[PDB]
Design an enzyme around this catalytic site. Structure first.
Site, PDB file in Angstrom:
ATOM      1  N   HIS A  61       0.776  -1.230   0.000  1.00 63.09           N
ATOM      2  CA  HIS A  61       0.000   0.000   0.000  1.00 63.09           C
ATOM      3  C   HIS A  61       0.827   1.310   0.000  1.00 63.09           C
ATOM      4  O   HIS A  61       0.233   2.399   0.032  1.00 63.09           O
ATOM      5  CB  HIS A  61      -1.049  -0.013   1.114  1.00 63.09           C
ATOM      6  CG  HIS A  61      -2.369  -0.397   0.530  1.00 63.09           C
ATOM      7  ND1 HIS A  61      -3.247   0.565   0.040  1.00 63.09           N
ATOM      8  CD2 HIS A  61      -2.835  -1.629   0.191  1.00 63.09           C
ATOM      9  CE1 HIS A  61      -4.244  -0.116  -0.527  1.00 63.09           C
ATOM     10  NE2 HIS A  61      -4.040  -1.434  -0.455  1.00 63.09           N
ATOM     11  N   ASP A 124      -8.036   3.548   8.910  1.00 62.22           N
ATOM     12  CA  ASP A 124      -9.355   3.641   8.264  1.00 62.22           C
ATOM     13  C   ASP A 124      -9.575   2.397   7.400  1.00 62.22           C
ATOM     14  O   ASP A 124     -10.708   1.986   7.196  1.00 62.22           O
ATOM     15  CB  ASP A 124      -9.400   4.863   7.298  1.00 62.22           C
ATOM     16  CG  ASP A 124      -9.309   6.256   7.902  1.00 62.22           C
ATOM     17  OD1 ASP A 124      -9.508   6.393   9.129  1.00 62.22           O
ATOM     18  OD2 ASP A 124      -9.048   7.208   7.142  1.00 62.22           O
ATOM     19  N   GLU A 235     -13.117  12.104  13.260  1.00 61.47           N
ATOM     20  CA  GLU A 235     -12.515  12.425  11.974  1.00 61.47           C
ATOM     21  C   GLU A 235     -13.262  13.610  11.367  1.00 61.47           C
ATOM     22  O   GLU A 235     -14.087  14.239  12.032  1.00 61.47           O
ATOM     23  CB  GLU A 235     -12.423  11.220  11.016  1.00 61.47           C
ATOM     24  CG  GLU A 235     -11.369  10.223  11.455  1.00 61.47           C
ATOM     25  CD  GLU A 235     -10.880   9.287  10.381  1.00 61.47           C
ATOM     26  OE1 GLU A 235     -10.209   8.294  10.731  1.00 61.47           O
ATOM     27  OE2 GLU A 235     -11.178   9.528   9.190  1.00 61.47           O
TER      28      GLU A 235
HETATM   29  C1  LIG Z   1      -3.338   1.946   0.293  1.00 55.90           C
HETATM   30  C2  LIG Z   1      -3.901   2.498   1.574  1.00 55.90           C
HETATM   31  C3  LIG Z   1      -3.027   2.886   2.586  1.00 55.90           C
HETATM   32  C4  LIG Z   1      -3.498   3.397   3.793  1.00 55.90           C
HETATM   33  C5  LIG Z   1      -4.884   3.509   4.002  1.00 55.90           C
HETATM   34  C6  LIG Z   1      -5.764   3.139   2.976  1.00 55.90           C
HETATM   35  C7  LIG Z   1      -5.292   2.638   1.767  1.00 55.90           C
HETATM   36  C8  LIG Z   1      -6.273   2.327   0.662  1.00 55.90           C
HETATM   37  N1  LIG Z   1      -5.408   3.988   5.192  1.00 55.90           N
HETATM   38  C9  LIG Z   1      -4.561   4.321   6.144  1.00 55.90           C
HETATM   39  C10 LIG Z   1      -5.090   4.827   7.380  1.00 55.90           C
HETATM   40  O1  LIG Z   1      -6.262   5.042   7.614  1.00 55.90           O
HETATM   41  N2  LIG Z   1      -4.136   5.132   8.330  1.00 55.90           N
HETATM   42  C11 LIG Z   1      -2.781   4.983   8.180  1.00 55.90           C
HETATM   43  O2  LIG Z   1      -2.039   5.228   9.134  1.00 55.90           O
HETATM   44  N3  LIG Z   1      -2.292   4.542   7.006  1.00 55.90           N
HETATM   45  C12 LIG Z   1      -3.136   4.238   6.030  1.00 55.90           C
HETATM   46  N4  LIG Z   1      -2.632   3.808   4.836  1.00 55.90           N
HETATM   47  C13 LIG Z   1      -1.167   3.848   4.652  1.00 55.90           C
HETATM   48  C14 LIG Z   1      -0.436   2.628   5.206  1.00 55.90           C
HETATM   49  O3  LIG Z   1      -0.320   2.712   6.629  1.00 55.90           O
HETATM   50  C15 LIG Z   1       0.960   2.486   4.596  1.00 55.90           C
HETATM   51  O4  LIG Z   1       0.818   2.273   3.192  1.00 55.90           O
HETATM   52  C16 LIG Z   1       1.895   1.431   5.191  1.00 55.90           C
HETATM   53  O5  LIG Z   1       3.060   1.324   4.378  1.00 55.90           O
HETATM   54  C17 LIG Z   1       1.260   0.075   5.426  1.00 55.90           C
HETATM   55  O6  LIG Z   1       0.926  -0.554   4.172  1.00 55.90           O
HETATM   56  P1  LIG Z   1       1.451  -2.071   3.924  1.00 55.90           P
HETATM   57  O7  LIG Z   1       1.028  -3.046   4.944  1.00 55.90           O
HETATM   58  O8  LIG Z   1       0.973  -2.489   2.542  1.00 55.90           O
HETATM   59  O9  LIG Z   1       3.040  -2.019   3.852  1.00 55.90           O
HETATM   60  P2  LIG Z   1       4.033  -1.771   2.625  1.00 55.90           P
HETATM   61  O10 LIG Z   1       3.490  -0.647   1.827  1.00 55.90           O
HETATM   62  O11 LIG Z   1       4.217  -3.065   1.830  1.00 55.90           O
HETATM   63  O12 LIG Z   1       5.415  -1.443   3.347  1.00 55.90           O
HETATM   64  C18 LIG Z   1       5.601  -0.105   3.879  1.00 55.90           C
HETATM   65  C19 LIG Z   1       7.003   0.037   4.420  1.00 55.90           C
HETATM   66  O13 LIG Z   1       7.156  -0.820   5.576  1.00 55.90           O
HETATM   67  C20 LIG Z   1       8.114  -1.831   5.311  1.00 55.90           C
HETATM   68  N5  LIG Z   1       7.635  -3.077   5.911  1.00 55.90           N
HETATM   69  C21 LIG Z   1       6.571  -3.840   5.503  1.00 55.90           C
HETATM   70  N6  LIG Z   1       6.301  -4.846   6.299  1.00 55.90           N
HETATM   71  C22 LIG Z   1       7.271  -4.752   7.287  1.00 55.90           C
HETATM   72  C23 LIG Z   1       7.581  -5.572   8.391  1.00 55.90           C
HETATM   73  N7  LIG Z   1       6.896  -6.669   8.713  1.00 55.90           N
HETATM   74  N8  LIG Z   1       8.638  -5.218   9.159  1.00 55.90           N
HETATM   75  C24 LIG Z   1       9.324  -4.111   8.843  1.00 55.90           C
HETATM   76  N9  LIG Z   1       9.121  -3.262   7.835  1.00 55.90           N
HETATM   77  C25 LIG Z   1       8.086  -3.656   7.072  1.00 55.90           C
HETATM   78  C26 LIG Z   1       8.311  -1.851   3.789  1.00 55.90           C
HETATM   79  O14 LIG Z   1       9.553  -2.391   3.350  1.00 55.90           O
HETATM   80  C27 LIG Z   1       8.122  -0.365   3.459  1.00 55.90           C
HETATM   81  O15 LIG Z   1       9.306   0.400   3.671  1.00 55.90           O
HETATM   82  O1  LIG Z   2      -6.962   6.096   3.097  1.00 54.38           O
HETATM   83  C1  LIG Z   2      -7.450   6.540   4.078  1.00 54.38           C
HETATM   84  N1  LIG Z   2      -8.857   6.641   4.287  1.00 54.38           N
HETATM   85  C2  LIG Z   2      -9.922   6.359   3.360  1.00 54.38           C
HETATM   86  C3  LIG Z   2     -11.144   6.871   3.768  1.00 54.38           C
HETATM   87  C4  LIG Z   2     -12.252   6.786   2.944  1.00 54.38           C
HETATM   88 CL1  LIG Z   2     -13.853   7.292   3.536  1.00 54.38          CL
HETATM   89  C5  LIG Z   2     -12.129   6.265   1.678  1.00 54.38           C
HETATM   90  C6  LIG Z   2     -10.897   5.852   1.200  1.00 54.38           C
HETATM   91  O2  LIG Z   2     -10.955   5.314  -0.099  1.00 54.38           O
HETATM   92  C7  LIG Z   2      -9.801   5.016  -0.820  1.00 54.38           C
HETATM   93  F1  LIG Z   2     -10.150   4.649  -2.084  1.00 54.38           F
HETATM   94  F2  LIG Z   2      -9.147   3.971  -0.227  1.00 54.38           F
HETATM   95  F3  LIG Z   2      -9.037   6.145  -0.894  1.00 54.38           F
HETATM   96  C8  LIG Z   2      -9.764   5.924   2.040  1.00 54.38           C
HETATM   97  N2  LIG Z   2      -6.688   7.090   5.159  1.00 54.38           N
HETATM   98  C9  LIG Z   2      -5.253   7.258   5.232  1.00 54.38           C
HETATM   99  C10 LIG Z   2      -4.419   7.003   4.141  1.00 54.38           C
HETATM  100  C11 LIG Z   2      -3.048   7.244   4.260  1.00 54.38           C
HETATM  101  C12 LIG Z   2      -2.542   7.840   5.428  1.00 54.38           C
HETATM  102  C13 LIG Z   2      -3.390   8.155   6.494  1.00 54.38           C
HETATM  103  C14 LIG Z   2      -4.760   7.931   6.358  1.00 54.38           C
HETATM  104  C15 LIG Z   2      -5.686   8.255   7.534  1.00 54.38           C
HETATM  105  C16 LIG Z   2      -6.600   9.445   7.280  1.00 54.38           C
HETATM  106  O3  LIG Z   2      -7.669   9.311   8.184  1.00 54.38           O
END
Ligand SMILES: *Cc1cc2c(cc1C)nc1c(=O)[nH]c(=O)nc-1n2C[C@H](O)[C@H](O)[C@H](O)COP(=O)(O)OP(=O)(O)OC[C@H]1O[C@@H](n2cnc3c(N)ncnc32)[C@H](O)[C@@H]1O
Ligand SMILES: O=C(Nc1cc(Cl)cc(OC(F)(F)F)c1)Nc1ccccc1CCO
Length: 451
Positions: A61, A124, A235
């Site tokens: 992500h 979220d 929020e």
């Molecule tokens: C795509 C997305 C992201 C997202 C979100 C909604 C969507 C649609 N909503 C979020 C939210 O409400 N609040 C929030 O804090 N973040 C939100 N995100 C962002 C998300 O936290 C980040 O994208 C994060 O990177 C987690 O995503 P994911 O699980 O897919 O991890 P990754 O992208 O592959 O890796 C991110 C970095 O971390 C390192 N990594 C991955 N796994 C590990 C482990 N097990 N140990 C150590 N490091 C790790 C990766 O190498 C990279 O640097």
């Molecule tokens: O992706 C997030 N929320 C989210 C909320 C809604 Cl209603 C729709 C949505 O749809 C879509 F398509 F996934 F974008 C996403 N949050 C997020 C992302 C990165 C960093 C921090 C955050 C926390 C912000 O609260």
């Protein structure tokens, strides 16, 4: 125990992320069975002549190739017997040991079916890995009260950049524990996380109310996060006049069988103290799991329209509460004046441990401002225009001296990272890298260090 894969679909998946821009390809994808397998691969990288890049991939992500390991190996952490929740009389509550690659949605389903327990602090969207969010912060509407997910973890098993498996917590190897938390994968791969749990609510009273006045909107959000009768989630989001900007306040009141008879009056008492536009209160009543999974429901509707696998030039900023009014004038009304949500809500810095690697503004109350816009499908110019708008936002903060900090930072230059952390935090971050990943093998896609 594990297996190296050169399957084209495995390589393609490890060469992309939700951002849809960065495409650095690894040589292979590693599928581990356990922590010792991850230790073996990292150990081999540390001992190798060239010192190839190793990066863990959660659910992919990342926005700008943070989980990519150019010409190295990507560890596919996705998922075997699972540990049951445990009660501790010493900690005064429950916990659960989870594999670093576990998705929060699967963690929730497991803990609910084993005692009706659940994590207290969320993101979220639940289709994110535990190690992935714990390497950043993991933020949602609960963080003002419980802190981010990095403030709700007791212990970790970490595979360092030397391939050593280390158990860490506040009492054992704390420098590694606090360094890894919000550490951007720089000091090791999380193979186990011990997550704090509470008895889960059964249902949620989900409320939305509209505002035309930004001063009233922010004053109400700031009062709500200071609250005893309180909402469990706070929020907000920026709305365009076509259903001029409107601000939507989004709150919840969690309840179970015991509190079901007091939920209506708790909500009415709390809402009576607010200054939202009369007749704009919208309410929903649904199970706790359904509320938490609300973004996955939005995802299915996007996948159905071919609007999910598109570029996502997402920008997330922490903005000091002292500069939020100026932010609305210049950004929401200025830069964005004239597809995707723009979220905004304050949080309490005292819920964030300053010993962690997480970078927040130097103010007790700060907002997360999340610009979650998507580019049009198969339209490269849409992505370019969104990228210019993001740069205008950053230029605005820089030009008016707003001490904003990027969440999920996309910096690449060394002086940008020094500025992001500041002198004290940068020194602590570099010293941790020297100790736990001297060859800069791990999470090189973050673009902070080089061999
Ligand atoms: C795509 C997305 C992201 C997202 C979100 C909604 C969507 C649609 N909503 C979020 C939210 O409400 N609040 C929030 O804090 N973040 C939100 N995100 C962002 C998300 O936290 C980040 O994208 C994060 O990177 C987690 O995503 P994911 O699980 O897919 O991890 P990754 O992208 O592959 O890796 C991110 C970095 O971390 C390192 N990594 C991955 N796994 C590990 C482990 N097990 N140990 C150590 N490091 C790790 C990766 O190498 C990279 O640097
Ligand atoms: O992706 C997030 N929320 C989210 C909320 C809604 Cl209603 C729709 C949505 O749809 C879509 F398509 F996934 F974008 C996403 N949050 C997020 C992302 C990165 C960093 C921090 C955050 C926390 C912000 O609260």
């Amino acid at each position: 125990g594990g297996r190296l894969s050169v399957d084209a679909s495995d390589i393609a998946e490890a060469s992309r992320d939700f951002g849809g821009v960065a495409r650095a390809e690894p040589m292979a994808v590693f599928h581990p069975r356990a922590a010792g397998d991850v230790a073996g691969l990292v150990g081999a990288a540390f001992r190798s002549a060239r010192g190839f890049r190793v990066s863990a991939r959660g659910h992919g992500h990342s926005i700008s190739g943070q989980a990519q390991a150019a010409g190295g190996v990507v560890v596919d952490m996705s998922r075997v017997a699972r540990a049951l929740p445990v009660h501790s009389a010493a900690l005064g509550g429950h916990y659960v040991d989870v594999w670093g690659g576990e998705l929060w949605v699967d963690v929730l389903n497991w803990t609910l079916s084993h005692g009706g327990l659940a994590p207290r602090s969320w993101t979220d969207y639940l289709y994110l890995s535990v190690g992935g969010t714990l390497s950043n912060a993991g933020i949602s509407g609960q963080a003002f009260h419980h802190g981010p997910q990095i403030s709700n973890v007791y212990e970790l098993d970490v595979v360092t950049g030397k391939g050593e498996v280390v158990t860490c917590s506040e009492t054992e190897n704390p420098d590694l524990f606090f360094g890894v938390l919000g550490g951007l994968g720089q000091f090791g791969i999380i193979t186990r996380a011990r997550i704090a749990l509470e008895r889960a609510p059964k249902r949620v009273r989900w409320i939305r109310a509209l505002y035309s006045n930004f001063s009233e909107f922010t004053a109400d959000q700031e009062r709500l996060i200071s609250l005893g009768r309180r909402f469990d989630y706070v929020e907000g989001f920026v709305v365009a006049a076509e259903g001029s900007v409107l601000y939507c306040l989004e709150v919840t009141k969690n309840y179970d069988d015991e509190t079901a008879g007091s939920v209506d009056q708790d909500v009415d008492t709390l809402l009576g103290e607010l200054n939202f536009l009369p007749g704009t209160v919208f309410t929903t009543d649904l199970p706790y799991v359904d509320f938490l999974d609300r973004v996955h429901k939005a995802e299915l509707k996007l996948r159905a329209k071919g609007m999910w696998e598109v570029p996502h030039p997402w920008l997330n900023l922490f903005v000091p509460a002292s500069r939020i009014a100026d932010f609305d004038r210049g950004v929401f009304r200025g830069v964005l004046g004239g597809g995707g949500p723009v979220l905004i809500y304050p949080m309490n810095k005292h819920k964030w441990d300053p010993r962690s690697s997480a970078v927040t503004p130097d103010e007790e109350v700060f907002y997360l401002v999340a610009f979650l816009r998507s580019a049009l499908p198969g339209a490269p110019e849409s992505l370019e225009a969104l990228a210019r708008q993001n740069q205008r936002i950053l230029d605005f903060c820089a030009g008016t001296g707003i001490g904003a900090k990027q969440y999920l930072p996309g910096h690449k230059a060394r002086h940008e990272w020094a500025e992001h952390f500041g002198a004290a935090r940068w020194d602590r971050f570099a010293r941790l890298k020297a100790e736990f990943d001297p060859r800069a093998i791990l999470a090189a896609g973050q673009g902070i260090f080089r061999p």
